[PDB]
Write a protein that binds this ligand. Structure first.
Ligand SMILES: Nc1ccn([C@H]2CC[C@@H](COP(=O)(O)OP(=O)(O)OP(=O)(O)O)O2)c(=O)n1
Ligand SMILES: [Mg+2]
Lengths: 545, 388
DNA sequence: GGCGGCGCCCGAACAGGGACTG
DNA sequence: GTCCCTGTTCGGGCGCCG
């Protein structure tokens, strides 16, 4: 039936007008399905026969539904959508089973032909015109950009009084999918379910009996809900011989979907396989690291996994582990070996970075994801020494902070692989470095002058001033012993190196990092260029030619 | 009602709501039920295409939560110089009064907000304001007439007390002694129901090392600092000190300061003691406030409008310390200073990654307003230059 | 082959700052 | 000014849900 709720006032954008688009030819199957649907909808008041006074049209078509022998009528409303006012979406996100608390009794309801039970603004119906090889919509259509928001809000309004007088019953509301949980006995629960279904009826919403689940395991939002466990509906990865960009996109999307409950999923190398591509049909040969990463993911997926349900009275604990190459896995649990859920973080921020930075980024991702699913920050267990963190917190010139955390020594550990000195080292040879690069010819020079009288200048091709300053620092590091003072004229290089990086997109910064690690003491100092200072003056005169 | 339009060619705010903890959400639901019953807000739908993020803060030692709407975007699209010079200035919340004046009907759509739900159990519940929203830069503007009417007799009978309205609260200033001041503020509170000491706010200068043994490194550092400084005080000379480094020496080598060089250093210290030349406040341009983390819970800041023309410089000083919390207390102190001095909040350049600040800043926010901010990666030379 | 929500990942477009030319 | 480097944003693939 049609809901008696008020309709949402809806307008076109100013100066705009309805769509006039011809009707594509559909197969005999789609035409039969569409006439069988439309005759009944017009009988029911959901569409109205229209005539020459409606100068509008939009193409319709059909697709087989979820898995059933039933059909879905869609309208390619792209035009009308480009010409319809903006909406504010109310679906702020997707619910997750890990945020569900254990309930004694549980049922999942579906609403039948959902959109088609919510009415449509009377002034707006004309624009929804269509034809079959001519009706207009009186209810929410599928393909119109405003239907999801108007439906979700209408269903919120309908459920409002029931919730208001049934606070002990949880109704998780994804668009027309209702999860209903209670601590009532099966009998009282099924009676309250009946009250709910009658309520939805008074507001025009049928809950079909075929789509009514009453017994575990419930299929819900992509998962299987058991009384004490939840699992993910089976994830089947493609086993292609040759791979195309679209195929790796499907693969990595399915691995990302798995990463919520399968621990240790990694996509770094499969993701790299998409760097330079230009076509969803282009073929990509796997690397060897791609082979290994995908094999590992498959061997993970071949194992039986499950999550559990939240207990608000216990503590949320999030525990993080370092994978290779800026990738991280985490597990959120409450009791030692029984995960609420799992996840991964592998977002590569910054040209140069260290593990302490990535670990912080991961901690705040987990924090926001947990605020969403439970409304609570977790207690963290990180592979980083309180001393490492305190050292970094002290010597790092930006504000950084991590919530309550405790240390676990499941390696690999998070370490600052080197520490710049605060004061210059007595007796250590003192290196004044510099570099220059001709902007026209891309030629350059880099080198050092020391206090003991050592000089060096290497010539470089196809470089830039920044690259050549870093080359100078690298020169000093190579030709010095375990303790060295270095004086540079570039804030760029100084600023990279004081961040204490342990990885870099640049090969030169990687080589510099290896040299810094080898050293026992390094002291880096900055002088203003072109000022006639110290040895800066002579190395500057030396690398210009 | 007072009709309100927007700045021309601008459209209403469309800012997504951010996550809220369970206790903030619970307070927001309680507060918005009470506010809807009293007609101050009304449930709306998705056909209002506008949105503004909402959250809640806790009262100092009280257990009442305050609803805080972040109207920075809506404000973007819509003062006595003697206040700085008073002995005591008290900040006094008056935003509640704005809930008596209705809001222009055609404009109420721009105030919409969306309360979220844990785990997305329900779509967000949208509301709009029907009365003057607190946090909006239009509420004190409209309510100015009624406030002037309210304070006419108090201002008359207390001609030496300075009252300045900024968005949701009054700033009441006097040269009185703390006891008399407290009494008069209570007089004003009782009358209106129909702390800070800005004379002690001083300028944190730029200071140079004083020491009796200088090394090549120390003098290189000093020359770098003075070089960066001459871009502010153009009378700073470095010639002699820079001469003291001729050659290629070890950083640890001691370098005795010559008479000429020591005279250069003394005259440089004197120069730094002078006020900056040619810094005029422009009330059309926006205030920039830059912050540097100096470690040990010590923060430096500079308020300016054009580079090197600093209007104010200062410090914030405060075991189990929280960097983010110290930073939000810092920006709140700097903003209160700017609202006393210039009647205008600054645009902050925060030395923090956007995600850390955005996760945690609301946990520590205490004031009704919210300033503009950008996030920046500080060049370490600047922290080096403004440090103490 | 239509829509909205959230997720990931990559690249294009842009902003901003430091260093440099004659 | 130009060039070089770095960071953020946004949109377009795909995934998942209805
Ligand atoms: N591919 C899809 C699937 C769903 N929906 C929208 C239309 C209303 C709701 C449909 O959910 P279904 O589970 O398909 O239910 P239905 O349309 O009400 O039909 P049924 O009677 O089979 O539940 O979400 C959509 O726009 N596009
Ligand atoms: Mg349905």
């Amino acid at each position: 039936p049609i809901s008696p709720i008020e309709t949402v006032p809806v307008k076109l954008k100013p100066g705009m007008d309805g769509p006039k688009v011809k009707q594509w030819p559909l197969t005999e199957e789609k035409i039969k399905a569409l006439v069988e649907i439309c005759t009944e909808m017009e009988k029911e008041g959901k569409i109205s026969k229209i005539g020459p006074e409606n100068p509008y049209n939009t193409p319709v078509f059909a697709i087989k539904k979820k898995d059933s022998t039933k059909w879905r009528k869609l309208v390619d409303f792209r035009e009308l959508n480009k010409r319809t006012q903006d909406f504010w979406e109310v679906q702020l996100g997707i619910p997750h089973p890990a945020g569900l608390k254990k309930k004694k009794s549980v049922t999942v309801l579906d609403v039948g032909d959902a959109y088609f039970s919510v009415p449509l603004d009377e002034d707006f119906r004309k624009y929804t015109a269509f034809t079959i090889p001519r009706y207009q919509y009186n209810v929410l259509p599928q393909g119109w950009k405003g239907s999801p928001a108007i439906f979700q809000s209408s269903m919120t309004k309908i459920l409002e009084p029931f919730r208001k007088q049934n606070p002990d019953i949880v109704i998780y509301q994804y668009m027309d999918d209702l999860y209903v949980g209670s601590d009532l006995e099966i009998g009282q629960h099924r009676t309250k379910i009946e009250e709910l279904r009658q309520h939805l009826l008074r507001w025009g919403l049928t809950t079909p009996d075929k789509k009514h689940q009453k017994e575990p395991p419930f299929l819900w939002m992509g998962y299987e809900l058991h009384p004490d466990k939840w699992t993910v509906q089976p994830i089947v990865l493609p086993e292609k011989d040759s791979w195309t960009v679209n195929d790796i996109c499907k693969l990595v999307g399915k691995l990302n979907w798995a990463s919520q409950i399968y621990p240790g999923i990694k996509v770094r190398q499969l993701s790299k396989l998409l760097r330079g591509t230009k076509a969803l049909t282009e073929v990509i040969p796997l690397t060897e690291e791609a082979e290994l990463e995908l094999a590992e993911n498959r061997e993970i997926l071949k194992e039986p996994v499950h999550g559990v349900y939240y207990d608000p009275s216990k503590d949320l604990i999030a525990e993080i582990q370092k994978q290779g190459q800026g990738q991280w896995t985490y597990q959120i649990y409450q009791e030692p070996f029984k995960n609420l859920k799992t996840g991964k973080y592998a977002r590569m921020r910054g040209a140069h970075t260290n593990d302490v930075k990535q670990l912080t980024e991961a901690v705040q991702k987990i924090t926001t994801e947990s605020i969403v699913i439970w409304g609570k920050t977790p207690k963290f267990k990180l592979p980083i020494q309180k001393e490492t963190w305190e050292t970094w917190w002290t010597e790092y010139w930006q504000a950084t902070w991590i919530p309550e955390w405790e240390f676990v020594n499941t390696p690999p550990l998070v370490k600052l692989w080197y520490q710049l000195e605060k004061e210059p080292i007595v007796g250590a040879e003192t290196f004044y470095v510099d570099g220059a690069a001709n902007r026209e010819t891309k030629l350059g020079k880099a080198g050092y002058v020391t206090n003991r009288g050592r000089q060096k200048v290497v010539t470089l091709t196809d470089t830039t001033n920044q690259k050549t300053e870093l080359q100078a620092i690298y020169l000093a590091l190579q030709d010095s012993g375990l303790e060295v003072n270095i004086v540079t004229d570039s804030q760029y290089a100084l600023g990279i190196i004081q961040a204490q990086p342990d990885q870099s997109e640049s090969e030169l910064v990687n080589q510099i990092i290896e040299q810094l690690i080898k050293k026992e003491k390094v002291y880096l100092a900055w002088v203003p260029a072109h000022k006639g200072i110290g040895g800066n003056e002579q190395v500057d005169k030396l690398v210009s030619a | 009602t007072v009709p309100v339009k927007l700045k021309p060619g601008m459209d209403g705010p469309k800012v997504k709501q951010w996550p809220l903890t369970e206790e903030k959400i619970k307070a927001l639901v309680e507060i918005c039920t009470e506010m809807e019953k009293e007609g101050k807000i009304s449930k709306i739908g998705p056909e209002n295409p506008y949105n503004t993020p909402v959250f809640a803060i806790k009262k100092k030692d009280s257990t009442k939560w305050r609803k805080l709407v972040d109207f920075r975007e809506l404000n973007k699209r819509t003062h006595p110089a003697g206040l700085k010079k008073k002995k005591s200035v008290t900040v006094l919340d008056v935003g509640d009064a704005y809930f008596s004046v209705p809001l222009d009907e055609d404009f109420r759509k721009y105030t919409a907000f969306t309360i979220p739900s844990i785990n997305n159990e329900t779509p967000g519940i949208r509301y709009q304001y029907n009365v003057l929203p607190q946090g909006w830069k239009g509420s004190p503007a409209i309510f100015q007439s009624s406030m002037t009417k309210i304070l006419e007799p108090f201002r008359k009978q207390n001609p030496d007390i300075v009252i300045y309205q900024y968005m949701d609260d009054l700033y009441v200033g006097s040269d009185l002694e703390i006891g008399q001041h407290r009494t008069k503020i209570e007089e004003l509170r009782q009358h209106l129901l129909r702390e800070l000491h800005p004379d002690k706010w001083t300028v944190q200068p730029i200071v140079l090392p004083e020491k009796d043994s200088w090394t090549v490194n120390d003098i290189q550092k000093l020359v770098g600092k003075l070089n960066w400084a001459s871009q502010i005080y153009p009378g700073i000379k470095v010639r002699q000190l820079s001469k003291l480094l001729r050659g290629t020496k070890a950083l640890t080598e001691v370098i005795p300061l010559t008479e000429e060089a020591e005279l250069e250093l003394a005259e440089n210290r004197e120069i730094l003691k002078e006020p900056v030349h040619g810094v005029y406040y422009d009330p059309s341009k926006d205030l920039i406030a830059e912050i540097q983390k100096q470690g040990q819970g010590q923060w430096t800041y500079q308020i300016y409008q054009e580079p090197f023309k600093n209007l104010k410089t200062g410090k914030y000083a405060r075991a189990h310390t929280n960097d983010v919390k110290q930073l939000t207390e810092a920006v709140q102190k700097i903003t209160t200073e700017s609202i006393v001095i210039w009647g205008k909040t600054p645009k902050f350049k925060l030395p923090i990654q956007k995600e850390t600040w955005e996760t945690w800043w609301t946990e520590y926010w205490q004031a009704t307003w919210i300033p503009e901010w950008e996030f920046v990666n500080t060049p370490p030379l600047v922290k080096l230059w403004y440090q103490l």
